[PDB]
Design a binder for this molecule. Structure first.
Ligand code: F6C
Ligand code: CLA
Ligand code: CLA
Ligand code: CLA
Ligand code: CLA
Ligand code: CLA
Ligand code: CLA
Ligand code: CLA
Ligand code: CLA
Ligand SMILES: CCCCCCCCCCCCCCCC(=O)OC[C@H](COP(=O)(O)OC[C@@H](O)CO)OC(=O)CCCCCCCCCCCCCCC
Lengths: 124, 41, 80, 64, 742, 143, 31, 42
């Protein structure tokens, strides 16, 4: 642990204080796992399971939000809506884009998330 | 000002406002703990 | 010399002939399209290979193809 | 195939292979590629229509 | 019309200087040659192979001759830790006496080159002890090269040229190569290892004058014929055995100790003799599988054509593959490009295996302590392997252009991967994009944290999966009591059998934290492994994309009618620069070079920090990119670039000169790579004006000066980029290691 | 044998070289209604005489660039230009217009010289014409 | 021990056999 | 010590003549032979 690490205290008690090392060296040292160089190492264990879910799972929501807002705006379109973003249809695809997680599983089973092999252009 | 609103809905204007609006997390990364590691939130 | 081949998707628009800088191409009667014309490439010993004829062709895919072949002093565009 | 029918292209070398385009006009002059098909999506050369045979088209919408 | 080249009438009609350049880079493409039949093609390739083996034997003979005449082999076997092996002698008349003195060591009377190829260690581990032994080997290889040359000349004679059905025999060749090129050769190498190498390792001299006298074992072929084979594994070399001397020696010839000889820090010679014997027996067995002309055996064609459909008699691990492997045997056997691109992929995987295995399990005596030799050998084989993997995909594309038959391969696996090639290319693109964004952004975050005075805020992710695979082999470096790390586990004990007699020797070596066998890895290793993943994925993207789009894409549907290498299809359709499949191997050579740069940079810095003792330099300095820039490139350059300064010259003067030479060649590449053809053609037209109008200038070009063609200059700039990239790093790696650790 | 006055020009470095007299030269003749300045394809400005003009150039592309300039940059257009190929023995050969019309029009009697009744995407794929000499468009079938 | 002058001259004379065998194979492969 | 090039090896007079032959005496004849080979006419 970082609290009992013997090398992590030589960056504790000799560093600028400021507001980037004083309110950040604490919460960090309480709940991190340092090695031998006095450096927090991002671990992947059972204790990290409810730690790495908030970077991994909460990024998946906002990334799918962006990808589904870019989808629902662009199915309802036609070469002027990409230049001049129609703010009304953008808000319509954002409101539906909020709960995109449900809509995404309401497309795969219905077969309207994927296109047929003969309805998509290919090359020789 | 009929097309002044339309010019403000153009791709560069939406681009610049989107970057500055998502990138204003300056205040989110200064309000509480300007250093936030993976296991600390 | 290069090989300039004209295929039956030609529509006789003449644009390949007009775009040729070295006069390789001309129009011949065909009755295989409604223009009644098709391109031909007899003076293909003159072909430099610029493919302006292919840029001028409107059909998809091109009704005229240039295949760069053995280089001569004419196809290399050499005034020396 | 006559004017207005949406057709899918069966020409492998076409830019719009396996794509739906609207028939503009069919030529009854006995030429090799009589059907003119027009596409909402342009090719690389900047051309959105082309002449096809009837044998390389599949009707997907009868004209209304 | 000239008479050169005789293999192409179209290049003889060429009135310009292009035919000289195109006759050099189309000379070995026998398929596209005038009046070439398939039979004449195979026969010419056979004779070319013989001439190639002759060149290899002449090269090895020359290495042996120059170590025996100008090296210090006999002086180096006395102390292979404090004496630098010598390659050959310098005879540059342009040296000043300051360079003659700098390239002369303490024990030499002339300027010499220090050998970094490792042949001293290899020859010392296999029995060679004197310059006479080296000279005898060199003269044997000279005569063997003459034999290969005569064989190649002989099989071009009309009564001796093999028929095409002989070349198509894929059942006889596999039997004779498995059993007789891999088996009998490895059995003979086991014979040498127990007759010469292990005896000379113990101090007894065995030569072609007393080997019939001296038995390899006290009971000569008594335990083998009687069936008691465990006698050959009795009384091995003790831990306090000194190589080439009888102090600590044993008598065993085939034992399975595992780990390393503790005095040479290399693999045991009894283990290597036992290895090559157990390899020879299995390969001699395996060369009995296919039928030639004795009825018994398999047919490869019937085995491949039987993987068509579903069911247990059919291809059941992928029943939805259409015609399965029908036509795949003929695609392999008829196409020489399919075979060459397949064999190049196999050889490029084996060469990377060679590089990855010979540093972690050193096979030669005292080569783990020759640091520059170890580094040079790893980098050598990894770059050879990257080139072989690049040529594998090159000839996979050339097969799909030239030899692929879409009707013989109708709806099989090959034609089934050609169908959905956009899925393969887009998913390689996704993996490449994910790896690149994440690895670069993690490195740049670490840079910005360290620059802003917060090394503690770096994102340091441990390679827990590879640390666990290090633990399942018996590494107690971490707190993971896994399979072989757990001493009373099912894997460690071999419960019914208890015959893993390799376990104590192997755990003496993996836990020994001084060798390279399973080095300790931390957060700086995870990032560079993800960079290597990115590099292999993007190189595979470029090569796979260019091979699968070789026959045609949407931008150029009839690309197979234009060949493998062609400049472009003009500026129509938006422009079609670098559209050929050859241009993909072109564009992926840069990415192969970059990936192998990352690989060898990682290996070299990891080992420099280990060899110096300051492993924390790489540990807490390889997680951000300025640490790579400053603690690796800038720091280990101070001795190289001071090879000659305004005060004098040391023996690193040639490495400084070659460092600058590689920089020059790499920069010259950018001239061919950035500037394109029409600029130079107009410049050459002005030069032609100037020459015809100057007095007293009586020469005139027989063949018209033209600028290098588009594909030609792509190849020339790529060759320059490659040669300068290899020269710069070869000069830096030999001088940053040979100076710190002389 | 060729009629026409050489256009009034001061000379240039862009003109004829050795290959003009050892390989081939081209000549373009045209009639102009007035004495007027054109651009040489070799660089510079020359003046065409009123009446018949004859100019020797090194390439057929230069003669066709000049001819395209004559029929597009001048009002009234000069469309009566004729291009000849001159050989080192003196032999002159009338090449443009090859027929006597103008390739862009259609004459009854020209004849097919590049036509391949196919549709490009159906050339014989190269696995079958390997050791033959033919390459994929210089063939006769359609697969 | 070190090589002798006669051992170097033996090498030089014996490499004339691959030297002319290589020329024979090069001209038999027909440039 | 080393005022000039030496050979502490057998037949050390052989570099003295072999380096001129391989590097600046025989190469221009070889270049001339190859130039005459590539420029000969049918
Ligand atoms: C022989 C033949 C001939 C002649 C005569 O004869 C000649 C001449 C001239 C004159 C006139 C002039 C001036 C001179 C001077 O100053 O400068 C020098 C250079 C040189 C190179 C010099 C040269 C000399 C000669 C070569 C001599 C010889 C030597 C020997 C013989 C060798 C030996 C042999 C053996 C076998 C190896 C020139 C020049 C030029 N070039 Mg020129 N050449 C020629 C060749 C060549 C080739 C191969 C190439 C490719 C590399 C080129 C290239 C070039 C360029 C880039 C340029 C330039 O810049 C310049 C000019 O333009 O101005 C303006 N060019 N030029
Ligand atoms: C940077 C990668 C790298 C490294 C460290 C080496 C290292 C080595 N190579 Mg090499 N080699 C490489 C890439 C590399 N190779 C590639 C990509 C090719 C394919 C063309 C070769 C082909 C090759 C041959 C034919 C031979 C070697 C040999 C050797 C060994 C002796 C030379 C020496 O001591 O150090 C110096 C290393 C340098 C890179 C010095 C720079 C010299 C520049 C590169 C000359 C440019 C020529 C060309 C690009 C590659 C030449 C490499 C080689 C001659 C040194 C040495 C272990 C020799 C050997 O096997 O010993 C018995 C040998 O005969 N290699
Ligand atoms: C909102 C529109 C939108 C959506 C829903 C997608 C969705 C997707 N893209 Mg994509 N793309 C977009 C816009 C979009 N893209 C734009 C504007 C570009 C030009 C920069 C690209 C260029 C691109 C490439 C080169 C690739 C994808 C790929 C993908 C697929 C997975 C990987 C990924 O998302 O990261 C990739 C995202 C980018 C490279 C940039 C997108 C960021 C914008 C701002 C959103 C995925 C279904 C990958 C694929 O083919 O899947 C197998 C792939 O290789 N995209
Ligand atoms: C291919 C292996 C090889 C290589 C790379 C070298 C390299 C060298 N030799 Mg050596 N040599 C070799 C084989 C080789 N030798 C063999 C087998 C013999 C026994 C006859 C000799 C006998 C020899 C002598 C007497 C001398 C050298 C010397 C030298 C050095 C200067 C060059 C020279 O004078 O050439 C001289 C070459 C010969 C007299 C005979 C060469 C015969 C080889 C086998 C030719 C190999 C051709 C090759 C396989 C074809 C490649 C094709 C092409 C694409 C490159 C140089 C380092 C000189 C030296 O020591 O410098 C200080 C010196 O004077 N060599
Ligand atoms: C037992 C009989 C026999 C043997 C020994 C061979 C041997 C050979 N054949 Mg042949 N062949 C045979 C029967 C045989 N053949 C029959 C019956 C047929 C008719 C079907 C053929 C038809 C045939 C053809 C058409 C060709 C060959 C070729 C070859 C050569 C290719 C392999 C090579 O270059 O060397 C090296 C390979 C090895 C030494 C083994 C490689 C194993 C791995 C890759 C390396 C070993 C790993 C190990 C770590 C190495 C460390 C060493 C290091 C420390 C120095 C080789 C010498 C090729 C040729 O013509 O060459 C002239 C070729 O084109 N053969
Ligand atoms: C192809 C490889 C090869 C070859 C040519 C030989 C050849 C020989 N061996 Mg050997 N040997 C080999 C592999 C080989 N061996 C292997 C793989 C092992 C390990 C099992 C041995 C273990 C061995 C022993 C213990 C002895 C020989 C002996 C001999 C010699 C006489 C045996 C005979 O029957 O006649 C003979 C020259 C005998 C001998 O000493 O004669 C001089 C002898 O005592 N061999
Ligand atoms: C003719 C070939 C040959 C010969 C002479 C030997 C000889 C030997 N093997 Mg062996 N082995 C071989 C092929 C051979 N092996 C092959 C092909 C395999 C792969 C299945 C093995 C895998 C093997 C194992 C796992 C072991 C041996 C062991 C042994 C040694 C004692 C075993 C015994 O008494 O019987 C003995 C010197 C034992 C040993 O070395 O004990 C230290 C041992 O544990 N061998
Ligand atoms: C077993 C190995 C092997 C073999 C037999 C071949 C054989 C062949 N390849 Mg090849 N290839 C290979 C591996 C191999 N390849 C590898 C490892 C790569 C990746 C680098 C390639 C990538 C490749 C491409 C892209 C192409 C081929 C082609 C060919 C064919 C013609 C080659 C040629 O034109 O003649 C002779 C060519 C030369 C003699 C050129 C030599 C110059 C090279 C490039 C660099 C020389 C190094 C330089 C001089 C060092 C100087 C440094 C110092 C002095 C300063 C031929 C059948 C061509 C083909 O099939 O056409 C359709 C083709 O386009 N290959
Ligand atoms: C530092 C130089 C550099 C960089 C960053 C790249 C980056 C890339 N190359 Mg490239 N390449 C280079 C040099 C470089 N190349 C050179 C010298 C050549 C030889 C001509 C090539 C030839 C080449 C080919 C042929 C291909 C690539 C591909 C790619 C892309 C895939 C890898 C990836 O997705 O990572 C992630 C993306 C990045 C690392 C881009 C940086 C993102 C920025 C920093 C975002 C922030 C911007 C903001 C303003 C600040 C990627 C954008 C492949 C591809 O397109 O895959 C789809 C492709 O096929 N490269
Ligand atoms: C390495 C030591 C120093 C090197 C110096 C010598 C280097 C090679 C010199 C080339 C002269 C050969 C001229 C052939 C003249 C000849 O007989 O022409 C034969 C052939 C074409 O001849 P034609 O059929 O046109 O012959 C017609 C007329 O001769 C009369 O009809 O040319 C070739 O084969 C070129 C390929 C040779 C490729 C050579 C490379 C092989 C390396 C050889 C190593 C030589 C070592 C010799 C000493 C041991």
């Amino acid at each position: 642990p970082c609290a009992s690490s013997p090398a992590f205290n030589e960056r504790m008690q000799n560093a600028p204080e400021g507001y980037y090392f004083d309110t950040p060296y604490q919460s960090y040292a309480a709940n991190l796992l340092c090695g031998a160089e006095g450096l927090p190492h991002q671990q992947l264990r059972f204790d990290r399971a409810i730690d790495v879910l908030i970077p991994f799972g909460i990024f998946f929501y906002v990334a799918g939000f962006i990808g589904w807002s870019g989808r629902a705006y662009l199915i309802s379109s036609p070469e002027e809506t990409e230049i001049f973003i129609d703010v009304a249809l953008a808000i319509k695809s954002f409101v539906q884009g909020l709960l995109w997680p449900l809509l995404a599983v309401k497309e795969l089973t219905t077969g309207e998330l994927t296109a047929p092999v003969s309805e998509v252009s290919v090359s020789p | 000002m009929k097309y002044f609103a339309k010019y403000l809905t153009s791709a560069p204007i939406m681009a610049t406002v989107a970057l500055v609006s998502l990138s204003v997390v300056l205040i989110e990364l200064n309000h509480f703990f300007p250093g936030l590691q993976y296991g600390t939130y | 010399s290069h090989s300039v081949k004209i295929y039956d998707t030609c529509i006789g628009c003449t644009q390949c002939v007009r775009a040729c800088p070295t006069d390789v191409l001309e129009m011949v009667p065909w009755d295989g399209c409604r223009a009644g014309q098709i391109a031909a490439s007899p003076r293909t010993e003159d072909c430099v290979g610029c493919k302006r004829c292919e840029t001028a062709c409107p059909t998809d895919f091109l009704s005229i193809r240039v295949y760069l072949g053995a280089e001569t002093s004419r196809s290399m565009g050499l005034a020396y | 195939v006559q004017r207005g029918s949406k057709v899918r292209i069966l020409r492998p070398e076409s830019y719009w292979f396996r794509e739906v385009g609207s028939v503009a006009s069919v030529d009854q002059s006995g030429i090799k590629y009589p059907v003119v098909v027009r596409f909402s999506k342009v090719n690389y050369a900047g051309v959105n229509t082309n002449n096809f045979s009837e044998a390389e088209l599949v009707e997907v919408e009868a004209p209304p | 019309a000239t008479k050169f080249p005789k293999f192409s009438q179209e290049l003889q009609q060429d009135p310009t200087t292009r035919r000289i350049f195109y006759s050099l880079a189309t000379a070995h493409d026998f398929e596209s040659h005038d009046g070439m039949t398939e039979e004449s093609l195979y026969q010419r390739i056979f004779a070319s192979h013989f001439g190639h083996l002759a060149i290899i034997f002449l090269w090895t003979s020359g290495i042996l001759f120059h170590v025996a005449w100008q090296g210090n082999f006999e002086a180096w076997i006395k102390d292979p830790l404090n004496i630098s092996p010598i390659a050959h002698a310098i005879w540059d008349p342009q040296f000043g006496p300051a360079a003659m003195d700098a390239f002369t060591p303490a024990g030499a009377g002339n300027p010499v080159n220090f050998c970094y190829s490792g042949v001293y260690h290899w020859w010392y581990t296999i029995g060679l002890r004197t310059n006479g032994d080296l000279f005898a080997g060199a003269m044997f290889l000279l005569l063997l090269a003459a034999v290969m040359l005569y064989a190649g000349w002989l099989h071009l004679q009309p009564r001796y040229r093999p028929s095409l059905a002989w070349f198509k025999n894929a059942e006889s060749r596999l039997n004779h190569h498995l059993a007789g090129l891999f088996g009998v050769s490895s059995l003979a190498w086991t014979g040498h290892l127990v007759h010469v190498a292990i005896p000379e390792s113990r101090g007894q001299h065995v030569g072609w004058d007393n080997f019939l006298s001296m038995p390899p074992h006290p009971e000569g072929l008594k335990p083998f014929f009687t069936g008691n084979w465990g006698a050959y594994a009795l009384n091995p070399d003790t831990s306090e055995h000194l190589f080439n001397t009888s102090q600590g020696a044993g008598t065993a010839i085939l034992t399975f100790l595992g780990g390393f000889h503790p005095q040479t820090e290399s693999l045991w010679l009894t283990d290597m003799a036992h290895h090559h014997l157990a390899i020879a027996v299995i390969f001699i067995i395996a060369g009995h599988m296919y039928r030639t002309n004795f009825g018994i055996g398999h047919s490869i064609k019937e085995m491949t054509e039987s993987l068509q459909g579903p069911g247990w008699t059919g291809f059941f691990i992928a029943p939805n593959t259409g015609r399965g492997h029908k036509g795949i045997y003929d695609a392999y056997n008829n196409s020489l490009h399919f075979q060459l691109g397949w064999h190049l992929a196999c050889l490029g995987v084996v060469t990377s295996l060679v590089a990855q295995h010979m540093y972690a399990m050193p096979p030669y005596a005292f080569i783990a302590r020759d640091y520059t030799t170890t580094a040079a050998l790893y980098t050598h084989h990894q770059y050879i392997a990257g080139f072989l993997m690049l040529g594998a995909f090159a000839h996979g594309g050339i097969f799909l252009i030239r030899d692929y038959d879409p009707v013989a391969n109708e709806n099989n696996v090959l034609a089934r991967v050609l169908d959905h090639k956009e899925a393969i290319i887009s998913h390689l693109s996704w993996v490449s994009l994910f790896l690149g964004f994440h690895t670069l952004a993690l490195y740049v975050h670490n840079d910005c944290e360290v620059a802003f005075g917060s090394p503690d805020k770096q994102i340091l992710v441990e390679p827990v999966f590879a640390q666990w695979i290090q633990a399942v082999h018996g590494k107690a470096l971490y707190g993971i009591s896994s399979l072989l790390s757990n001493p009373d586990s099912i894997a460690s004990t071999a419960w019914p059998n208890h015959a893993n007699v390799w376990l104590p020797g192997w755990l003496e070596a993996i836990n020994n934290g001084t060798n390279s066998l399973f080095l300790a890895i931390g957060p700086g290793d995870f990032l560079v492994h993800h960079a290597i993943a990115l590099g292999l994925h993007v190189t595979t993207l470029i090569l796979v994309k260019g091979a699968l789009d070789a026959r045609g894409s949407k931008l150029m549907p009839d690309k197979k009618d234009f060949g493998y290498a062609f400049p472009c299809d003009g500026p129509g359709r938006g422009g079609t620069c670098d559209i050929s499949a050859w241009d993909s191997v072109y564009l992926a050579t840069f990415w192969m070079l970059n990936t192998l740069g990352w690989v060898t940079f990682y290996w070299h810095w990891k080992h420099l920090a280990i060899w110096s003792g300051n492993v924390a330099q790489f540990n807490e300095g390889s997680t951000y990119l300025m640490g790579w820039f400053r603690d690796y490139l800038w720091l280990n350059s101070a001795q190289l670039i001071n090879g000659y300064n305004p005060y004098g010259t040391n023996n690193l003067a040639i490495w400084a000169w070659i460092f600058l030479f590689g920089h020059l060649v790499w920069a010259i590449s950018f001239m061919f790579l950035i500037t394109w053809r029409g600029y130079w053609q107009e410049l050459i037209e002005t030069l032609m004006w100037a020459h015809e109008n100057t007095p007293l200038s009586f020469g005139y070009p027989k063949d018209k000066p033209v600028a290098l063609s588009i594909v030609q200059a792509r190849l020339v700039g790529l060759v320059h980029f490659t040669v300068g990239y290899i020269a710069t790093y070869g000069a830096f790696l030999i001088a940053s290691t040979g100076s710190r650790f002389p | 044998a060729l009629t026409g006055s050489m256009p009034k020009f001061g000379g240039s470095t862009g003109g004829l070289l050795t290959a003009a007299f050892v390989e081939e030269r081209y000549a373009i003749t045209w009639t102009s209604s007035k004495e007027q300045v054109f651009e040489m394809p070799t660089g510079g400005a020359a003046t065409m005489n009123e009446g018949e003009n004859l100019l020797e150039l090194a390439r057929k592309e230069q003669c066709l660039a000049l001819g395209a300039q004559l029929r597009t940059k001048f009002k009234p257009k000069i469309t009566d230009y004729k291009i000849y190929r001159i050989f080192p023995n003196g032999e002159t050969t009338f090449i443009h217009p090859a027929d006597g019309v103008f390739p862009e029009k259609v004459n009854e009697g020209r004849g097919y010289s590049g036509k391949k009744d196919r549709r490009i995407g159906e050339n014989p794929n190269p696995a079958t014409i390997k050791f033959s000499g033919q390459n994929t468009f210089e063939t006769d079938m359609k697969s | 021990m070190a090589l002798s002058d006669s051992q170097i001259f033996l090498a030089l004379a014996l490499a004339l056999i691959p030297g002319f065998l290589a020329l024979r194979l090069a001209t038999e492969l027909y440039k | 010590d080393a005022t000039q090039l030496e050979g502490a090896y057998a037949a050390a007079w052989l570099p003295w003549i072999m380096i001129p032959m391989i590097t600046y005496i025989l190469p221009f004849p070889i270049f001339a032979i190859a130039f005459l080979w590539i420029e000969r006419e049918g």
